[PDB]
Design a protein around this ligand. Sequence first.
Ligand SMILES: *[C@@H]1O[C@H](CO)[C@@H](O[C@@H]2O[C@H](CO)[C@@H](O)[C@H](O)[C@H]2NC(C)=O)[C@H](O)[C@H]1NC(C)=O
Length: 250
Amino acid sequence: LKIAAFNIRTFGETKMSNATLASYIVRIVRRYDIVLIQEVRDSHLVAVGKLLDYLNQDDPNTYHYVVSEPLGRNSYKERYLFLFRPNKVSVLDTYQYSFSREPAVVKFSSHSTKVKEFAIVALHSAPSDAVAEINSLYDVYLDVQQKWHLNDVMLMGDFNADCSYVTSSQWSSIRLRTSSTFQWLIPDSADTTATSTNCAYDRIVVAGSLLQSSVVPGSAAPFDFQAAYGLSNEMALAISDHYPVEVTLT
DNA sequence: GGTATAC
DNA sequence: GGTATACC
Ligand SMILES: *[C@@H]1O[C@H](CO)[C@@H](O[C@@H]2O[C@H](CO)[C@@H](O)[C@H](O)[C@H]2NC(C)=O)[C@H](O)[C@H]1NC(C)=O
């Protein structure tokens, strides 16, 4: 089971409109069984619909999705979009959890893996308030545990956990980090941006031993579509300034 | 300070 | 067509 969290810079009607960009986006999503897409600025699900038309042109049940409402304090809004292969997994529940874009949490049943039921917390943090936000994920964690009696939780997204947004000294005041409950599959040494900058913005965190035991070592990593598709830096950036981070459960 | 979008 | 962001 392959899972990915992908921040697609301003996914919307414009981006999905360009048959080329769309082609690539589609190709990327298809690698996965469950993919979280962030930075969905689609008031009307017009772009999300385009995507699903492509994904499901050969069959209408290749992919189902769960999308959250537009999240944001003022006029700027983003949605959390969960795309999934209905034949490998099913939603058992979902809920909207201090945060700019409050985490959307989804619960999945997985028949084909060691771990059977697990939750995914999605987070696209605010750059300027990343520290506060990654730390609050500790609360969300506790929240999920209380509600669902579930220990197996994968927390992933464009957490902005590096460079200017989370410094070396700042990591100590982040509970999701200091707690040995959590294993950070994407190290601070990974490069997850398509730009020149070398930062580990996108991450995947896992709690619970069933899950932790279901992760295939050496499987979690950024997915550099530039290199994989021998795309030009300009083409690459046109798709997104971030790379998908992925993992494989067994 | 810049770039960029949605709406 | 100004406002509200995500980055550099
Ligand atoms: C799909 O978007 C791409 C990427 O931005 C477009 O290709 C860019 O087009 C501009 C304007 O012609 C160029 O100056 C760039 O060189 C292009 N990039 C590549 C890497 O070819 C493309 O124009 C898109 N299309 C639709 C039909 O309008």
